[PDB]
């Protein structure tokens, strides 16, 4: 099961990548190119693809779509100023013919934060609510703790 993690920069994708790859949270750096690493979980070897989410290098992810089976969209639930800038990237992502049919984990990551946006509001504020013909599950997480992540795996695994 080849996985592709997508999201805006500074969402915590890379952090989740190594929270899961190393088991312990590390201090990440602006991902310039990409990372990829493999994670066996419950006899299942995810193959996750981390690509820089900076405004700049956004349209290079399509170079990655062909193969994906689950769109982990990882979210910074404190940054509300690009909440729209990101409710859109989501629609563009799965609309592109590449990702027509694919289960969709949503990491409401950065919940430990004060102004932590609730998991349901995430569902709402992304536009996830009025959409069907589609597996889309919302997963509250803290990437630096580990919260949610291995429950989100459960969904990827389970629902596939």
């Amino acid at each position: 099961m080849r996985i592709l993690m997508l999201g805006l920069d500074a969402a915590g994708k890379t952090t989740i990548l190594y929270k899961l790859k190393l088991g312990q949270s590390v201090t990440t750096i602006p991902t310039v190119g990409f990372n990829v690493e493999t994670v066996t979980y419950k006899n299942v070897k995810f193959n996750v693809w981390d690509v820089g989410g900076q405004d700049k290098i956004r349209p290079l992810w399509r170079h990655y779509y062909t193969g994906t089976q689950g769109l982990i969209f990882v979210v910074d639930c404190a940054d509300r100023d690009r909440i729209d800038e990101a409710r859109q990237e989501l629609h563009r992502i799965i609309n592109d013919r590449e990702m027509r049919d694919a289960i969709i984990l949503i990491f409401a990551n950065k919940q430990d934060l004060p102004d932590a946006m609730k998991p349901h509001e995430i569902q709402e504020k992304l536009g996830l609510t009025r959409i069907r013909d589609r597996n889309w599950y919302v997963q509250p997480s803290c990437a630096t703790s580990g919260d949610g992540l291995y429950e989100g795996l459960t969904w990827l695994t389970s629902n596939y």
């Binding site: 890379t14 990548l17 190594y18 929270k19 312990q24 949270s25 590390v26 201090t27 990440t28 750096i29 602006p30 991902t31 310039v32 990372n35 981390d50 430990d112 803290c142 630096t144 703790s145 580990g146």
Partner: protein
């Protein structure tokens, strides 16, 4: 039966962490690891290190851009030993050298057995081990590049005057101690409130005189004391010494970590412990071509990620650059000449 240089490399090779040593062993390893020093690397190398021991053995390690390791040892009895090898996963000879690496996250070390972070002195000693260890590059950023900002080096001579007396400081491998350090502070004209050095120190470096005293009062070998003297007597010396104490070199790394830094800082004030902010550790080298190379480390306390509550460690910021031969200790010139590389480490217990 072995020279210090052979012992270190063997230890470095086996595993500087492999949990077996008898403390008496570790303690004597840290000792050896202290003389190891980053020097100017070739454009095709990750970095290069060099050491001169009190038994006349000498250790040089190159690491090529493709993490390929080349070692040279010269013994007590004029033996020449070349070693080829790759650091892998078990050894990680690479983690155990003061070199910068390209990685998605800040390299995490562990400390040796009974190392603590409990006081000012246990801190300089953690830095004493972290400053010989590997770091991860933080890619250049106009926003955090302290040389990018509007006040570049503004605090240079205050940090210098302040850090002098209270740093680990190495000139071409020779340890400059606290008094020699204050002596070098005076030699620059910097015990002063907040003046700049003499127009003499600039342009002429230090005087032969001050230079001799300084090296005289410093720890190491005579031949090495002579390099110190000759290095001091150029202006690039001042440039290199002063810029090395520059406090904002840490900005990129603090940019990444500031909240777990704040936590570490808060976390100590609740206890009533009084350990300082930064611990400073500096290595300067002039190779025979007269090239000058600086590696400056600042260690600062920092909390582990939330998944490891109540665990404190050290964040080791390395800043490295050559001081091209022609650059005197004035702002505009150092702003345009120096091209600091920034890299950081996190070390825990």
């Amino acid at each position: 039966e072995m020279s210090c240089a052979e012992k270190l490399f063997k230890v470095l090779s086996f595993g500087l962490w492999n949990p077996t040593y008898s403390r008496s062993e570790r303690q004597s390893f840290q000792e050896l690891l202290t003389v190891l020093e980053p020097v100017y690397p070739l454009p095709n190398e990750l970095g290069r290190v060099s050491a001169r021991f009190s038994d006349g053995s000498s250790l040089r390690i190159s690491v090529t851009n493709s993490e390929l390791v080349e070692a040279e040892i010269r013994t007590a009895n004029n033996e020449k030993i070349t070693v080829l090898l790759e650091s892998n996963e078990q050894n990680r000879l690479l983690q155990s050298l003061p070199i910068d690496r390209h990685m998605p996250y800040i390299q995490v070390h562990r400390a040796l057995s009974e190392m603590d972070l409990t006081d000012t002195t246990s801190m300089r000693n953690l830095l004493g081990f972290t400053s010989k260890l590997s770091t991860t590059l933080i890619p250049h950023n106009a926003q955090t590049d302290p040389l990018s900002g509007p006040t570049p080096f503004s605090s240079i001579f205050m940090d210098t005057c302040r850090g002098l007396g209270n740093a680990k400081l190495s000139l071409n491998g020779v340890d400059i101690p606290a008094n020699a350090q204050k002596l070098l502070r005076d030699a620059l004209g910097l015990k002063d409130t907040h003046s700049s050095p003499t127009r003499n120190v600039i342009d002429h470096g230090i005087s032969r005189h001050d230079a001799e005293q300084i090296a005289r009062e410093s720890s190491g070998s005579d031949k090495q004391k002579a390099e110190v003297v000759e290095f001091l007597c150029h202006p690039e010396a001042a440039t290199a010494i002063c810029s090395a104490f520059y406090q904002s070199f840490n900005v990129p790394a603090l940019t990444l970590t500031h909240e777990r830094i704040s936590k570490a800082s808060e976390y100590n004030a609740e206890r009533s412990l009084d350990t300082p902010n930064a611990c400073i550790n500096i290595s300067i080298s002039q190779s025979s071509d007269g090239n000058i190379y600086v590696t400056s480390h600042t260690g600062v306390l920092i909390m582990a990620p939330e998944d490891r509550p109540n665990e404190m460690g050290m964040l080791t910021n390395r800043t490295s650059y050559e001081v091209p031969q022609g650059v005197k200790c004035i702002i505009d010139e150092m702003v345009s000449a120096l091209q600091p590389r920034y890299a950081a480490s996190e070390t825990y217990l």
